[PDB]
Design a protein around this ligand. Structure first.
Ligand SMILES: NC(=O)C1=CN([C@@H]2O[C@H](COP(=O)(O)OP(=O)(O)OC[C@H]3O[C@@H](n4cnc5c(N)ncnc54)[C@H](O)[C@@H]3O)[C@@H](O)[C@H]2O)C=CC1
Ligand SMILES: Cc1cc2nc3c(=O)[nH]c(=O)nc-3n(C[C@H](O)[C@H](O)[C@H](O)COP(=O)(O)O)c2cc1C
Ligand code: SF4
Ligand code: SF4
Ligand code: SF4
Ligand code: SF4
Ligand code: SF4
Ligand code: FES
Ligand code: FES
Lengths: 139, 226, 156, 225, 120, 439
């Protein structure tokens, strides 16, 4: 298998831990060529998922990235939740040498997510830049 | 009708052929000789897909999607390795004699043959022999003629004779010396001869009035007018 | 300035009587003009089109599709030697070399006096008696390179 | 009566997910050099307050965009006119979200009455010539003759004459005859028209000097000059 | 050959040209202008040229007093020789017939065969 | 060799001096008896069923059942216009059987056309004959005139009221005209491009009417079936293919000729007992069973019966059953180059793989002939053989084109590998640009 092959990364133990903690219907696994598991989480469970990843036996300790995407003109969204905008959170676990990309789907009118700064202080500037360039409000 | 393309089920119109049914679904099949307004003839042999007899079948058979009806319970594959190899081979056979003309050809950036050469993935030339050459004809003040760029897809003769009812454009010659044009130099007499520049997938027939002050398609400012 | 003779037009119309479509007499009309004139000139295409009621492009496409309808001038005699597989096994190449040596021309060309035009043709259906050639209407078999100069002198 | 022209196209506030419709492709080039010979400073992008299109590539031209007015067809991988297949709901059918244009009227519930004004048959009167209109695709429309590429395609200005009338007037094919319409004598070369009925002279409508209003008018003193 | 590939490959859009044609049929630029106040000297236009006409040369001394004089027209660009590619000729490969090179005289091209030819 | 009418239905009435048999001598030697029986005592459906259970297969080279092809003309009575076409093109290299059939026995073909047109209810019959057969055309026209003046053709044949008109259509020299849909297109006065099937010619053929195209030898087998019965024809040979076939070996043999043999006769008997074996100083190397469009076979396949199934199971085709012998003096690359040159120049130009891939194989074999082959040439030839097979081209001309190439590459690869001498070079050096050295 080549390194650029599209993988859903369902064999990642983080997917099994998330399924055991939150349930099989709590999130949607997306197959990408990013090399990391992309997991679409509901907005109301975002802080719970972040805390669960922070309190893992080999935890996800660094918020690598946090930004947004305008999904309104994206024609090919097969296997994706209905989203006008999306916010992605890239988290790196150094102990596992792994990373996970959480994604939160937002409608055009309800453009607000809970703030991530109580878990990761770099989310301050990351959410400020997301609000500046996309208009997404972080409560 | 119910068809299965690459393992995915689709509902189509059973009176349609597989090429127009799959193009209506957004699937990409290369094609040259077929036109929606002109019907299917099976000439260019570019639209080959692999059809299977039933749900469980591994051999299959390369069929012609423009010549195959999209009947109920059909099973075809576009991204099959043999089908992709044959479509690339058909593009390669068309490109054996094609002139090195894209910079000085008015169909550049608007060429169906360019699009399907790129889309099949053919970019390496192993043919090392000569390319056949044709003299050109004067077709009047509107259509510019360059027979070297022809792929013998028979769209021009089919449109101009069968569709538009014209009588002064035909196909001549033989095996690989087929010539598409008028029997002698002269103006194209049909009142709808200008549609040849869009019917022809190559730069054989080009807009001469556009060619006088030529610019590429990406450089145009377009509007929808009447 | 081409005009059809009375005999040519009558033969073409009599050929048109045999078919339910006048288009079906195009090959025989071209062959009639070729038999009367040696080859089919440019005006003959339009004359046959006007007699038959089909476009001139169809007549030109038919005349250029078929190898035995000549749209270019030929000599007074047409040598057609077979270069197919059984005559290649039987050695047509010596026959072709002898023809090129005597006539001093390549295949597809005409002699300087307009007497002979040399042409390769497909299999003549005489493979058991190969190598075969066909001068204007006579097919000659069991050809040898030494019999070519004697055979060519009987076609003045 | 013209109240249906409002639905021909949406107004200037029509947007596709908030953005206008692109007039030019996204790879439009030469933006900082095409006007540089006049001035090196790039001017303002032209504002289109009238319609929903923008004079720039900063717009929408997606095949799946909910619109009917498509300035041009382009899909990634389909640069030819075959991108219209991507712009249709089914290939060879209509556009995906309907075709542009709205009929101004529906068909009536009731028809008209029969027209009882049956004309008499054409009588060729002596000394007058009925002008039969001859139309040309290259030459009859007013704006098309101004196009300089059409002069190579427009036919020479002729006058069509029946063989019996031309023999009566002693004129062959190609000779010049002069006729006066509205007190204006012009000359044209004669073309013999076998299918034209006698007592009629055929004039090419919409050409230079021959108005299309002359169709059906009578012609006087048509005589070889 | 005024094929407009350099102008579209430019990420700054600082190339502007128009195609003209001679009587024999060869293509050439009617004008060719480059905004050097906009050019970032990235070399994508030289990379995109299918005839190796446009080239970037070892010359950096390009300072100017007025920005209007940084628009270089065709008389400021066309040099008297081939430059970095000394022997390439696109028209020796193209099938389009020009002066001094008829049909079938290009590289890897056979002579044209009439449909009226007697050979099968 | 004695030729009784029982075991030689086609060639027992051939004259010893190779002269044509005219109407009086033909009728003396049991002529038009089957035509009389068919046109007086049998229904057209009865004749069609008799041909169907007689096992008469197509002698053109495909082996399709003639009765089955006759059955699927439409049963509608409104389609009163019907056409029967005789495929006297015979442009395949190595095939000369139909020339012997119609040059000296034209009345057999006329009688078979009459019987088949009565069975098919065909109102007209055309003989699409190649233009190179001059004496065949003369003899056919003379036989048609003799049958018309004696009441065998025209209006009210034998008083039964069946009107049948027979014409001879001389071709203009193109190999693709033998394809039956291209034969119909050429009969209509068009370019002889074939037609996509379905619809088959039996439903909508010549001018949109029901049309049946059949070979000369099939319509020559018909009168013997109608004159001697189905039981006689099914008991000629104890093989799956019923009846007799014109077989024969050609090319550097002692007796190159053409004989009528029952099906199941092995190819060694035709080469040795009939053709006399190979010539002096020549050793047998290979053979083609059915003309230029069939796979080459080695000496190990010489002990194989000449049936469709047996040669088909060996990796070849029976074809026209006119085998051609290749000795050790013939270079296989040059022979395949000659074959491919014929096939490339007799392409009709309709479809891309044949039209634009047979010249590629021609150029590769020309390079291999003079030792200018390069690595990848034989692989290109094999890919051309795989991608010009059945279903990949518009008609069956290109599969027959690539059959000898793939069989010769399979059996004589050491001759093709001898032509690869030069290294591969598609590009020349361009000064100033470093090439991309692919490994
Ligand atoms: N000069 C000659 O005798 C030559 C003979 N051939 C032979 O031609 C053969 C290929 O001929 P094709 O017609 O292309 O192929 P084919 O085998 O598909 O057709 C042969 C006959 O069967 C009939 N047929 C087949 N399937 C039918 C169906 N479902 N319904 C009704 N009719 C049907 C066709 O109409 C035709 O008459 C080869 O086997 C080859 O040996 C090839 C070249 C030259
Ligand atoms: C390329 C090609 C050429 C053919 N040429 C001939 C031919 O010359 N004569 C012939 O009888 N059949 C020829 N055939 C076979 C016909 O298609 C058809 O099978 C035959 O003419 C009549 O069928 P039958 O065998 O039942 O009589 C050719 C087929 C192909 C594909
Ligand atoms: S017709 Fe197409 S492929 Fe051919 S030279 Fe023109 S742009 Fe290039
Ligand atoms: S000239 Fe154009 S439309 Fe006609 S066959 Fe050639 S490529 Fe097709
Ligand atoms: S080098 Fe300059 S002109 Fe050329 S592509 Fe780059 S920015 Fe444009
Ligand atoms: S400089 Fe090169 S890329 Fe630019 S238009 Fe001229 S030939 Fe084309
Ligand atoms: S294979 Fe294709 S191009 Fe070749 S003869 Fe048949 S239809 Fe014509
Ligand atoms: S598009 Fe189907 S063969 Fe040409
Ligand atoms: S191969 Fe020459 S006559 Fe048949």
């Amino acid at each position: 298998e080549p390194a650029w092959q599209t993988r859903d990364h369902l064999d990642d133990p983080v997917i099994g831990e998330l399924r055991n903690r939150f349930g099989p219907d709590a999130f949607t696994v997306q197959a990408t060529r990013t090399g990391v598991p992309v997991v679409w989480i509901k907005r109301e469970q975002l802080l719970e998922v972040g805390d669960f990843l922070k309190k893992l036996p080999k935890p996800y300790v660094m918020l690598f990235d946090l930004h947004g995407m305008d999904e309104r003109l994206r024609t090919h969204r097969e296997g994706l939740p209905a989203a006008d905008f999306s916010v992605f959170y890239h988290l790196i676990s150094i102990d596992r040498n792994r990373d996970i990309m959480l994604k939160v789907a937002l409608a055009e009118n309800d453009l607000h997510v809970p703030t991530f700064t109580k878990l990761f202080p770099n989310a301050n500037w990351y959410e400020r830049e997301t609000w500046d360039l996309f208009g997404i409000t972080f409560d | 009708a119910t068809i299965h393309v690459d393992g995915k089920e689709y509902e189509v119109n059973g009176a349609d052929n597989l090429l127009e049914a799959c193009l209506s679904l957004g699937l990409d099949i290369p094609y040259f000789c077929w036109h929606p307004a002109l019907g299917s003839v099976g000439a260019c042999r570019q639209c080959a897909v692999k059809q299977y007899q039933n749900a469980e079948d591994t051999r299959g058979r390369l069929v012609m999607s423009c010549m195959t009806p999209a009947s109920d319970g059909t099973f075809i594959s576009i991204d099959d390795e043999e089908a992709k190899q044959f479509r690339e081979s058909v593009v390669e056979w068309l490109m054996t004699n094609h002139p090195h003309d894209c910079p000085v050809c008015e169909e550049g950036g608007n060429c169906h043959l360019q699009d399907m050469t790129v889309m099949t993935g053919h970019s390496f030339r192993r043919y090392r022999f000569t390319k056949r050459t044709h003299r050109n004809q004067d077709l009047g003040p509107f259509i510019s003629h360059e027979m070297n760029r022809c792929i013998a897809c028979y769209r021009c003769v089919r449109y101009y004779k069968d569709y538009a009812g014209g009588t002064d454009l035909g196909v001549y010659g033989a095996h690989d010396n087929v010539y598409f044009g008028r029997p002698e130099d002269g103006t194209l007499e049909s009142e709808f001869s200008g549609n040849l520049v869009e019917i022809c997938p190559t730069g054989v027939f080009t807009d001469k009035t556009h060619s006088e002050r030529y610019n590429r398609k990406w450089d145009m400012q377009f509007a929808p007018s009447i | 300035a081409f005009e059809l003779s009375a005999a040519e037009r009558e033969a073409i119309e009599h050929e048109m009587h045999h078919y339910e479509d006048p288009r079906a007499a195009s090959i025989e009309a071209l062959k009639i003009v070729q038999k009367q004139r040696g080859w089919v000139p440019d005006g003959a295409i339009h004359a046959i089109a006007d007699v038959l009621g089909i476009p001139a492009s169809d007549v030109e496409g038919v005349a250029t599709f078929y190898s035995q309808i000549f749209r270019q001038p030929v000599g007074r005699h047409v040598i057609r030697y077979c270069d197919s597989v059984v005559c290649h096994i039987n050695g047509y190449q010596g026959i072709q070399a002898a023809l090129e040596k005597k006539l001093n021309i390549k295949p597809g060309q005409t002699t300087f006096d307009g007497r002979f035009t040399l042409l390769p043709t497909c299999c003549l259906g005489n493979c058991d008696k190969g190598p075969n050639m066909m001068i204007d209407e006579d097919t000659h078999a069991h050809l040898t390179p030494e019999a070519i100069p004697e055979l060519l002198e009987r076609y003045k | 009566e013209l109240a249906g022209i409002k639905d021909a196209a949406p107004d200037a506030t029509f947007r596709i997910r908030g953005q206008k419709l692109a007039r030019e492709p996204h790879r439009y080039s030469g933006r900082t050099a095409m006007r540089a010979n006049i001035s090196v400073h790039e001017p303002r992008q032209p504002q289109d307050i009238d319609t929903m299109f923008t004079f720039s590539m900063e717009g929408n031209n997606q095949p799946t965009a909910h619109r009917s007015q498509v300035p041009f067809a382009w899909a990634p991988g389909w640069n030819s006119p075959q991108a219209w297949n991507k712009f249709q709901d089914e290939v060879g059918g209509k556009l995906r979200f309907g075709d542009p244009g709205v009929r101004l009227f529906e068909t009536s519930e009731n028809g008209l009455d029969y027209f009882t004004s049956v004309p008499a048959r054409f009588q060729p009167q002596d000394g007058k010539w009925r002008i039969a209109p001859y139309y040309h695709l290259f030459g009859s429309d007013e704006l098309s003759q101004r196009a300089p590429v059409f002069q190579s395609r427009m036919p020479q200005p002729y006058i069509k004459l029946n063989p019996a009338d031309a023999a009566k007037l002693g004129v062959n094919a190609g000779t010049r005859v002069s006729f006066s319409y509205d007190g204006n004598t012009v000359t044209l070369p004669v073309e013999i028209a076998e299918g034209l009925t006698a007592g009629q002279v055929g004039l090419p409508m919409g050409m230079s000097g021959i108005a299309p209003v002359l169709a059906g008018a009578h012609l006087e003193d048509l005589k070889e000059a | 050959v005024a094929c407009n590939l350099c102008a579209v490959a430019c990420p700054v859009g600082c190339i502007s040209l128009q195609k003209a044609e001679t009587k024999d049929g060869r293509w050439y630029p009617e004008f060719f202008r480059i905004n050097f106040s906009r050019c970032i000297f990235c070399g994508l236009c030289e990379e995109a040229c299918p005839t190796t006409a446009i080239q970037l040369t070892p010359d950096f001394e390009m300072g100017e007093y007025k920005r209007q004089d940084l628009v270089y027209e065709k008389e400021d660009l066309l040099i008297s020789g081939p430059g970095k590619y000394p022997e390439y000729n696109f028209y020796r490969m193209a099938g389009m017939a020009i002066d001094g090179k008829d049909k079938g005289e290009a590289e890897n091209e056979a002579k044209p065969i009439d449909v009226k030819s007697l050979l099968p | 060799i004695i030729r009784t009418p029982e075991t030689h239905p086609l060639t027992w009435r051939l004259r010893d001096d190779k002269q044509p048999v005219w109407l009086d001598e033909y009728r003396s030697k049991n002529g038009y008896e089957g035509a009389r029986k068919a046109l007086t005592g049998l229904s057209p459906d009865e004749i069609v069923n008799q041909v169907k259970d007689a096992g008469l297969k197509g002698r053109g080279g495909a082996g399709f059942s003639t009765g089955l092809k006759w059955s699927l003309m439409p049963k509608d009575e409104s389609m009163n216009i019907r056409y029967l076409l005789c495929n006297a093109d015979e442009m395949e290299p190595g095939t000369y059987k139909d020339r012997l059939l119609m040059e000296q026995l034209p009345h057999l073909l006329v009688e078979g056309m009459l019987i088949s047109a009565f069975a098919l209810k065909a109102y007209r019959g055309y003989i699409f004959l190649r233009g190179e057969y001059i004496e065949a055309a003369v003899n056919l026209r003379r036989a048609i005139a003799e049958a018309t003046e004696a009441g065998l053709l025209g209006k009210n044949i034998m008083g039964t009221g069946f009107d049948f008109e027979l014409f001879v259509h001389t071709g203009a020299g193109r190999y693709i005209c033998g394809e039956e849909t291209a034969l119909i297109n050429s009969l209509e006065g068009r370019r002889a491009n074939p037609r996509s099937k379905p619809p088959f010619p039996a439903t909508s053929g010549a001018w949109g009417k029901p049309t049946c195209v059949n070979n000369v030898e099939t319509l020559c087998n018909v009168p013997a079936i109608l004159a001697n019965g189905v039981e006689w024809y099914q008991n000629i040979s104890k093989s799956k293919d019923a009846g007799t076939k014109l077989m024969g070996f050609s090319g550097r043999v002692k007796n190159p000729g053409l004989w009528e043999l029952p099906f199941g006769t092995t190819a060694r008997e035709i080469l040795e007992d009939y053709a006399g074996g190979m010539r002096d100083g020549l050793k047998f190397k290979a053979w083609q069973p059915g003309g230029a469009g069939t796979d080459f076979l080695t000496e190990a396949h010489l002990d194989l019966p000449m049936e469709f199934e047996s040669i088909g199971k060996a990796g070849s085709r029976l074809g026209t059953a006119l085998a051609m012998a290749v000795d050790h003096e013939i270079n296989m690359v040059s022979l395949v180059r000659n074959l491919e040159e014929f096939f490339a120049r007799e392409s009709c130009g309709w479809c891309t793989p044949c039209r634009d891939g047979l010249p590629w194989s021609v150029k590769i074999l020309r390079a291999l002939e003079r030792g200018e082959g390069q690595p990848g040439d034989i692989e290109t030839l094999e890919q051309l053989c795989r991608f010009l097979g059945p279903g990949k081209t518009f008609c069956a001309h290109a599969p027959g084109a690539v059959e000898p190439l793939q069989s010769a590459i399979k059996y004589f690869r050491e001759e093709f590998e001898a032509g690869i001498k030069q290294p591969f070079s598609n590009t020349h050096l361009i000064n100033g640009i470093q090439p991309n050295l692919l490994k």
